[PDB]
Write an enzyme that holds these catalytic residues in place. Structure first.
Site, PDB file in Angstrom:
ATOM      1  N   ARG A 164     -15.570  -6.763 -16.108  1.00  0.00           N
ATOM      2  CA  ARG A 164     -13.426  -6.813 -15.462  1.00  0.00           C
ATOM      3  C   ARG A 164     -12.526  -7.574 -16.540  1.00  0.00           C
ATOM      4  NH1 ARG A 164     -11.397  -4.633 -11.144  1.00  0.00           N
ATOM      5  NH2 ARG A 164     -12.746  -2.696 -11.901  1.00  0.00           N
TER       6      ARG A 164
ATOM      7  N   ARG B 201       0.837  -1.169   0.067  1.00  0.00           N
ATOM      8  CA  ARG B 201      -0.094   0.062  -0.193  1.00  0.00           C
ATOM      9  C   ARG B 201       1.057   1.105   0.295  1.00  0.00           C
ATOM     10  NH1 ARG B 201      -3.972   3.728   2.871  1.00  0.00           N
ATOM     11  NH2 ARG B 201      -2.477   3.843   4.840  1.00  0.00           N
TER      12      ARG B 201
ATOM     13  N   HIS C  19     -13.793   6.273   0.167  1.00  0.00           N
ATOM     14  CA  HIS C  19     -12.861   6.357  -1.112  1.00  0.00           C
ATOM     15  C   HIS C  19     -11.792   6.516  -0.136  1.00  0.00           C
ATOM     16  CE1 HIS C  19     -10.361   5.377  -4.540  1.00  0.00           C
ATOM     17  NE2 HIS C  19     -11.206   4.455  -5.025  1.00  0.00           N
TER      18      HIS C  19
ATOM     19  N   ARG D  88     -19.266   6.681 -11.353  1.00  0.00           N
ATOM     20  CA  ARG D  88     -19.782   5.516 -11.736  1.00  0.00           C
ATOM     21  C   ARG D  88     -20.951   4.980 -10.714  1.00  0.00           C
ATOM     22  NH1 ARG D  88     -15.058   1.305 -10.613  1.00  0.00           N
ATOM     23  NH2 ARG D  88     -15.454   2.277  -8.527  1.00  0.00           N
TER      24      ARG D  88
ATOM     25  N   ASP E 163     -20.522   1.115  -6.002  1.00  0.00           N
ATOM     26  CA  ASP E 163     -21.131  -0.647  -5.141  1.00  0.00           C
ATOM     27  C   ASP E 163     -22.120  -0.223  -4.534  1.00  0.00           C
ATOM     28  OD1 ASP E 163     -18.562  -2.300  -6.261  1.00  0.00           O
ATOM     29  OD2 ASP E 163     -17.797  -1.929  -4.436  1.00  0.00           O
TER      30      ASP E 163
ATOM     31  N   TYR F 152     -19.415   3.258   0.882  1.00  0.00           N
ATOM     32  CA  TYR F 152     -19.401   4.501   1.632  1.00  0.00           C
ATOM     33  C   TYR F 152     -17.560   4.579   1.561  1.00  0.00           C
ATOM     34  CZ  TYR F 152     -24.255   6.160   0.282  1.00  0.00           C
ATOM     35  OH  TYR F 152     -25.123   6.217   0.096  1.00  0.00           O
TER      36      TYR F 152
ATOM     37  N   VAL G 255     -21.114   1.052   6.973  1.00  0.00           N
ATOM     38  CA  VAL G 255     -21.624   1.279   6.439  1.00  0.00           C
ATOM     39  C   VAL G 255     -20.940   1.025   4.685  1.00  0.00           C
ATOM     40  CG1 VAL G 255     -23.561   2.469   4.749  1.00  0.00           C
ATOM     41  CG2 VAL G 255     -22.812   2.558   6.858  1.00  0.00           C
TER      42      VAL G 255
ATOM     43  N   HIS H 283     -10.178  -0.094 -13.791  1.00  0.00           N
ATOM     44  CA  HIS H 283      -9.972   0.727 -12.217  1.00  0.00           C
ATOM     45  C   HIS H 283      -8.539   0.986 -11.933  1.00  0.00           C
ATOM     46  CE1 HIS H 283     -10.491   3.271  -9.062  1.00  0.00           C
ATOM     47  NE2 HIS H 283     -11.717   4.071  -9.296  1.00  0.00           N
TER      48      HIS H 283
ATOM     49  N   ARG I 121       8.732  -9.732 -11.082  1.00  0.00           N
ATOM     50  CA  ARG I 121       9.012  -9.998 -10.334  1.00  0.00           C
ATOM     51  C   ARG I 121       9.861  -9.732  -8.994  1.00  0.00           C
ATOM     52  NH1 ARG I 121      13.093 -12.662 -12.967  1.00  0.00           N
ATOM     53  NH2 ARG I 121      12.255 -14.749 -13.159  1.00  0.00           N
TER      54      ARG I 121
ATOM     55  N   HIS J 182     -12.219  -9.006  -2.082  1.00  0.00           N
ATOM     56  CA  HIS J 182     -12.388  -7.804  -3.879  1.00  0.00           C
ATOM     57  C   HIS J 182     -13.734  -7.891  -4.362  1.00  0.00           C
ATOM     58  CE1 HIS J 182     -10.603  -6.287  -7.045  1.00  0.00           C
ATOM     59  NE2 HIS J 182     -10.474  -7.380  -7.800  1.00  0.00           N
TER      60      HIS J 182
ATOM     61  N   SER K 273      -7.768  -8.759  -8.967  1.00  0.00           N
ATOM     62  CA  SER K 273      -8.197  -8.874 -10.686  1.00  0.00           C
ATOM     63  C   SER K 273      -7.186  -8.680 -11.726  1.00  0.00           C
ATOM     64  CB  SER K 273      -9.395  -9.150 -10.463  1.00  0.00           C
ATOM     65  OG  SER K 273     -10.056  -7.127 -10.931  1.00  0.00           O
TER      66      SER K 273
END
Ligand SMILES: O=C([O-])CC(=O)C(=O)O
Ligand SMILES: O=C([O-])CC(=O)C(=O)O
Ligand SMILES: [Cl-]
Lengths: 433, 434
Positions: free
Chosen positions: B404, B44, B321, B330, B378, B319, B316, B239, B424, B275, B245
Site C-alpha cells: 500500500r 460517507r 461490498h 483481485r 481478503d 464478503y 462472514v 484502491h 483543510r 482498516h 491509509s
C-alpha cells in the site's frame, strides 16, 4: 469536587441526547459540493464534526462560545503568574464547563504523577541521530508510547462500543502527562537518563514542569513560565479542519489508539504549511535583521517586504485559509509582550512589531495574499527567542505539546458518540469532466 | 535506451496539467449535496477528494487508468522467472498511465535493489523496540525515521520552486519503496537486525524476490511463493483515495510533510483495527470452520456453518461490498494463481475458501443484511500466505503496508506536480447543526 472523568461522565448523556436529535435530521441539506472543493483540498466544505472549538471568520477561534479574552478572564491560573492554565483549557474543551481552581490543582497533580516513561522510550530516543529533525523525533516517540495504550489492549480483548470512551480518556490523560517530558528529551539529547526519569514537582502546573524539564525552572524564569502557559493554551485547538486535528481524528476513526492517532497529527504538524510556520517566521525575521540591522527604520522594513514579494516569495505568518480578521491568538501574545519592558527593548521583537504595522498594507497593495493580517505564527517564535530559547528548530516541538489538547478531547467525544470511520469518496480528473 | 521512470513521468506531466486547468475552469460547478448525515457519518457518500490512479467500477471492480485486473495480468511485465505481474510494473502504470516495456521494469528493479540499504541509526532504532511492540507500530516508526534521508525536506529548506516540488517527492518515493521491504523484514526478524539490515541484494532480481530473500524465503525452492508475493503486492497497491491509509498519506502530505512522514501517517491508519485487519480475520474464521467441520466436509456442512455464524449475530468476513456487484477481480486473480499450483489446490484450507466462495453469496443474500455478498480479496489472501508457511497472521498487515506504499506515493507525486493545496475542510459542532 468532581474530578475530570466524573465531570465528563455527567455531560455525556446530554451530548448523546443532542446527537440523537441531530441524527433524526440526517436527510437535511446544509451545503453543496463543488468542483472547487474536490481540487482545492476541501476548502469551504463543512464536512466534519468538532465540538470543542468553532473558528469564526470574523472573531477568530472560540471555545464553547468563549473568546480568548473570556478564557483569560475565567480560567484558573497557576499558584503564581498571570496566565491561564492549559490544563484548565483542556477541562473546558472536554466538559463545556470552567473548572474551579482546586479541580485544576487535582488535575495538574495527575499530569505530574503520570509523566514517567517506560525504559524502552529512553532507549529509542537515545538511538536517534542528533541531526534527526525534532518533530520527527517527537512523532516517533509518541507513536512508540502505544505499547502503553489501554484502548488498544481493551479493544483487542473485546470491548463494547459503549465502553470505548473511557480507555480513550485514560490514554489521552497519559499522553498529555508524558508529552512534555518526551519534548524535553528531544531538546536535551545529552541528558536522556536524568531528564527522562526526573520526578516532577507534584503541586506545580503542567507548563511549569515542562519548563523545569527544559532546564528553565525557578524564579529567574517566571515570565517565561507565563509565556509558556499562554502559548500552550492558545494553540491547543483550532477546529477540526487543520491538518493535525484532522489527521488525529482520521487515524482515530479507524480505532487506532490516541498514541498512534496523535502521532499522525504530529506528522501533519511537521509539515512546512502547518506547524513549521512559526520556525519559518523566526528564520525570515532574523535574515531580515541580518540585512537591515538592529537600528532598522520603517523604510528598511518596507523595502525588504517589497523585495521579498517581488522575488516571488511569501511573507510568512500573514494570511489565513479561513480567518478574515487579525488572529486573536496573535493579539493575546502581543498583549503579553506589551507589559514586559525587556521584551519590548529586544530589537528582534521591535522588528516583529513594526513588521505587523507595515506588512498588512504592503500585502494588500501587492494584492496576491487573501486576508493579509498577522496570524499567531508571526509572533510566537520571537517570544521564545527572547527567553533564550534561541534554537528555532525546536519551537514546533512546543506546538506539538499544545496541540495534543484539542484533538485528544475530540477523540474522546468521537468514541463516546460512536462516530464511524472517516471515509470520503475519491474521483479522478477525467471523472470530473 | 528507453526512458527511465522519471523521464516517462516527465513526459505525461504537461498533459495532466492541461487536464487540470480544464477541470479548474469548471470550479463553480455543483457535483453533490452535503447533508447532516455526511457530517456525522464520517463523510460517507461525499465526493470530495482527487485520486488519479484508480477508480472503482461497480461492474468490473477496481481499475487502474481504465485497466481491469485481467488487463493488468495480461499486459504488465513479469519477473525473470514466474507467472505473475510485477508490483514495480503496477507502480509504473499507476504513475504514468502507460505499460512499461520489460527492460524499463528491469532498470527500475535495479534502482530499487541499489537504494535498499538503511542508515545505521535505523538499525539502532529497530533494536531498541521491545519484543511486544505491535508490528505496525514498529513499521510506522521506522518509515518516519527514514525522513533523515528526505531530499524533499532538505530541498524545501533550501528554497525550492513549486514547479519543482514533484522531483524530490519522486526521489524520496523511490527511496522509500526501495527500503520498505528491508524495514518490513526487520519487523519480522528482530533477532537478526545486523545481518538482514546489511545483507546485499541480488542486483538483477525484482522487488518482491528481494523482499522474500530478506524474509528468509529466497531461492528456487520458494519460486511459487515469490509469484504469490508479487501478485499480492501488485493487487493491493491502490484502491481509490477514500480508505484511511491512502487518505492519511495524502492529508499529511498536503501540508508538505515529506513522503516518509506522510506514508508513516498512512501506516498508522493501517494499524487501525477497522482498516488493517480483514485478511487476519478471514484466516481465523476459515481455520475455526475447518476445525469444527473437518477435512471431509460437504456443501451442506459449509452451508450450516455459514447460517450458524449469521444466527449467532456474527459477520462472514471477506464478503460484501458497498458498490461492487460481482466477485472482486483481485479475489479472482488470486484464485487464478491457485488454479495452476496443484499443491495449493490439494490444501483443504484452500478447498474450504473455494467452496465457501461458491455457497456464501447465496446464503448471505437469503440472510439479507449484507449488501452485495460476493467475495473480496481478503477472502483468499490470508489462506494463500498460510499455505506458503507464512503462518504469523499478526504480520499480514505489515505485508499490506509494503503493497500500500505504491498507490498513495503515486498520488503524492501527482499532488506535488499539480500543486494541490493543503487538505483543510470546515468543521462544525452539534449545536451548529441544530
Ligand atoms: O458546551 C457546549 O457547547 C454545549 C454542550 O455541552 C453540548 O453540546 O451538549
Ligand atoms: O453507549 C451508548 O448509549 C451509545 C452507543 O451504543 C455507542 O457508543 O455507539
Ligand atoms: Cl482530575
Amino acid at each position: 469536587e468532581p474530578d475530570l472523568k466524573t465531570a465528563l461522565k455527567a455531560v455525556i448523556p446530554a451530548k448523546r441526547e443532542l446527537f440523537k436529535q441531530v441524527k433524526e435530521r440526517s436527510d437535511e441539506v446544509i451545503g453543496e459540493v463543488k468542483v472547487a472543493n474536490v481540487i482545492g483540498g476541501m476548502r469551504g466544505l463543512k464536512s466534519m464534526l468538532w465540538e470543542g472549538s468553532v473558528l469564526d471568520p470574523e472573531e477568530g477561534i472560540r471555545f464553547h462560545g468563549k473568546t480568548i479574552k473570556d478564557c483569560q478572564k475565567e480560567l484558573p491560573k497557576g499558584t503564581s503568574g498571570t496566565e491561564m492554565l492549559p490544563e484548565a483549557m483542556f477541562w473546558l474543551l472536554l466538559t463545556g464547563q470552567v473548572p474551579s481552581t482546586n479541580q485544576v490543582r487535582a488535575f495538574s497533580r495527575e499530569l505530574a504523577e503520570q509523566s514517567h516513561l517506560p525504559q524502552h522510550i529512553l532507549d529509542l530516543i537515545k538511538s536517534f541521530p542528533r541531526s534527526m529533525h525534532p518533530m520527527t523525533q517527537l512523532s516517533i516517540a509518541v507513536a512508540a508510547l502505544n505499547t502503553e495504550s489501554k484502548f488498544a489492549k481493551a479493544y483487542e480483548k473485546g470491548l463494547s462500543k459503549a465502553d470505548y470512551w473511557e480507555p480513550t480518556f485514560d490514554d489521552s490523560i497519559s499522553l498529555l502527562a508524558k508529552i512534555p517530558r518526551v519534548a524535553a528529551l528531544v531538546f536535551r539529547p545529552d541528558e536522556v537518563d536524568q531528564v527522562g526519569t526526573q520526578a516532577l514537582d507534584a503541586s506545580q502546573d503542567w507548563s511549569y514542569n515542562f519548563a523545569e524539564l527544559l532546564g528553565k525552572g525557578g524564579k529567574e524564569n517566571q515570565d517565561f513560565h507565563d509565556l509558556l502557559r499562554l502559548y500552550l493554551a492558545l494553540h491547543g485547538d483550532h477546529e477540526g479542519g487543520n491538518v493535525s486535528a484532522h489527521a488525529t481524528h482520521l487515524v482515530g476513526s479507524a480505532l487506532s489508539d490516541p498514541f498512534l492517532s496523535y502521532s499522525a497529527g504530529l506528522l501533519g504538524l511537521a509539515g512546512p504549511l502547518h506547524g513549521l510556520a512559526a520556525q519559518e517566521v523566526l528564520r525570515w525575521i532574523l535574515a531580515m535583521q541580518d540585512k537591515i540591522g538592529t537600528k532598522f527604520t520603517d523604510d528598511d522594513v518596507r523595502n525588504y517586504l517589497w523585495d521579498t514579494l517581488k522575488s516571488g516569495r511569501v511573507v510568512p505568518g500573514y494570511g489565513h485559509g479561513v480567518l478574515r480578521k487579525p488572529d486573536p491568538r496573535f493579539q493575546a501574545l502581543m498583549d503579553f509582550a506589551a507589559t514586559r519592558p525587556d521584551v519590548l527593548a529586544n530589537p528582534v521583537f521591535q522588528l516583529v512589531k513594526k513588521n505587523s504595522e507595515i506588512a498588512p498594507a504592503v500585502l494588500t497593495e501587492h494584492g496576491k495574499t487573501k486576508n493579509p493580517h498577522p496570524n499567531v505564527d508571526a509572533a510566537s517564535g520571537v517570544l521564545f527567542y527572547h527567553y533564550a530559547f534561541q534554537q528555532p528548530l525546536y519551537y514546533t516541538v512546543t506546538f506539538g505539546v499544545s496541540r495534543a489538547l484539542g484533538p485528544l478531547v475530540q477523540l474522546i467525544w468521537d468514541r463516546a458518540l460512536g462516530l464511524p470511520i472517516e471515509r470520503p469518496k475519491s474521483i479522478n480528473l477525467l471523472g470530473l469532466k
